[PDB]
Every structure is written in C-alpha cells, then in structure tokens.
Amino acid sequence: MYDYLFKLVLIGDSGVGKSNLLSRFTKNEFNLEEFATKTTKVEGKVVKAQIWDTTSAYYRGAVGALLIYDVTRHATFENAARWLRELRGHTDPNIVVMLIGNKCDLRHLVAVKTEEAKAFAERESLYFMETSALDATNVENAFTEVLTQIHKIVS
C-alpha cells in the first residue's frame, strides 16, 4: 500500500489558483472555470499525500503546507502574513512551509516582484518558488520538495 500518509494543506485567498495547483499535481488537469491523493516515491519510500484545499480539523495532522498568492494581485501576497499567522497557531512548529507565487506565466501582469517575495520568505524562513498551474511551471517539483523536506525531517 504505502509507507507514509503525509497530509498537506493549501491556503491562500480566493482565486489564487489553489484548486488548479491541486488538479495539476494530482491529475495533470487544469480547469479554466476537499482532499486529493497522489502517491509518489520520495527517496525510495512510497508516500501517499492527502492534499487539502479550502478549521481545526482542516489543519490538524498537516505535515506540510503551501502558502499560495497570486503574482498579479499584490493584495493576495500582503495577506500571506495573516495566513501564516493562522497556519502557525494550528500546526506543529516544524511543518514544512512553501510560499508559492502562482500564475507566473502572466509575466507582464506581475504585481509582486520575486525579490520582494524571496525577502519575506527568508525572513519567515519559508521555501519559495513561483509556479504556473496553467502550463505546469514548477507545480510538480514544488510538491516533491515539500514532501522531500518532510521525509528528510522524519529520518
């Protein structure tokens, strides 16, 4: 069956691409108009990720999280702070967190610049990569580095 059942959660404001980050990783499908499962071999061991996407029951058990904002809407990145506050009051301290700037294929509507976000993420000690669920930029290995950082910690 599997070796680990890693629970991940997805948080972000309305319409930053959470649902499509989930369907792009789990199903390779992107919808131009809740918990998903994938199983992958992280460092030999089979891992079955249960990936939640929108309250105690939401967070509890989560070994990992992806804080997602929308590159073209600066207000959704400002709210990464209130989100990080809610996350940390509900999960184990040593949860793997990755700041995610999605819709990075809208290169000319970027309202949140990378070094801005790389600065906040290093202050709050997060991992960070910009993604596109539309054309699958960095979707896969983002999830596989969250799940690989978690496997690092549990051994």
Ligand SMILES: Nc1nc2c(ncn2[C@@H]2O[C@H](COP(=O)(O)OP(=O)(O)O)[C@@H](O)[C@H]2O)c(=O)[nH]1
């Ligand atoms: N350009 C672009 N648009 C995206 C991307 N991901 C999601 N969207 C758009 O965001 C809208 C809804 O995103 P959704 O995943 O439902 O938002 P959620 O509420 O955060 O889950 C859809 O019309 C998508 O076209 C992306 O990677 N690139």
Ligand SMILES: [Mg+2]
């Ligand atoms: Mg959603």
